[PDB]
Amino acid sequence: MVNWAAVVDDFYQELFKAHPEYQNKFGFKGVALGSLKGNAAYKTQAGKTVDYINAAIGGSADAAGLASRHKGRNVGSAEFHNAKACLAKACSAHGAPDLGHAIDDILSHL
Numbered sequence: 001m002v003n004w005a006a007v008v009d010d011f012y013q014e015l016f017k018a019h020p021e022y023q024n025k026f027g028f029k030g031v032a033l034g035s036l037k038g039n040a041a042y043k044t045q046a047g048k049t050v051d052y053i054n055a056a057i058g059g060s061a062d063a064a065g066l067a068s069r070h071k072g073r074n075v076g077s078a079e080f081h082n083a084k085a086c087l088a089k090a091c092s093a094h095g096a097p098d099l100g101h102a103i104d105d106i107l108s109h110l
């Protein structure tokens with residue numbers, strides 16, 4: 001099975017390396033990037049992201065709901081376009097299918 005947990009870890013590394021300030025919105029604010037894997041708040045968040053990916057592939061993802069929750073944290077289209085790029089890099093690094101269509105689905109509600 002595609003190692004989505006590893007893809008997601010690389011995704012967050014790319015995302016926070018390019019936009020360190022995005023990390024301030026999470027429960028692992030301030031934590032060194034090389035230590036995220038040892039952080040409980042991060043472990044939970046990464047698990048939810050992996051779940052969302054498996055839901056998008058499986059056909060049950062609620063893109064509208066995910067978009068609305070992100071708007072609820074003041075996260076919008078710009079951030080998601082940046083995330084789309086970071087996730088494409090993470091997928092490519094693992095020879096995983098690209099998730100651009102799934103991100104476009106979320107973007108369609110932002």
Ligand code: HEM
Nearest residue numbers: 022023025026027048049052069073075079080083084087
């Ligand atoms: C690849 C794109 C992204 C995906 C698939 C994704 C997925 C998720 C999921 C599944 C959750 C949990 C949702 C829930 O509350 O039920 C979440 C929460 C959150 N996301 Fe995203 N996200 C993405 C990009 C971003 C970006 C770019 C930001 C910018 C800061 C962000 C900020 C947040 C924040 C602040 C939370 C709430 C965390 C908390 O409750 O402590 N996300 N995300």
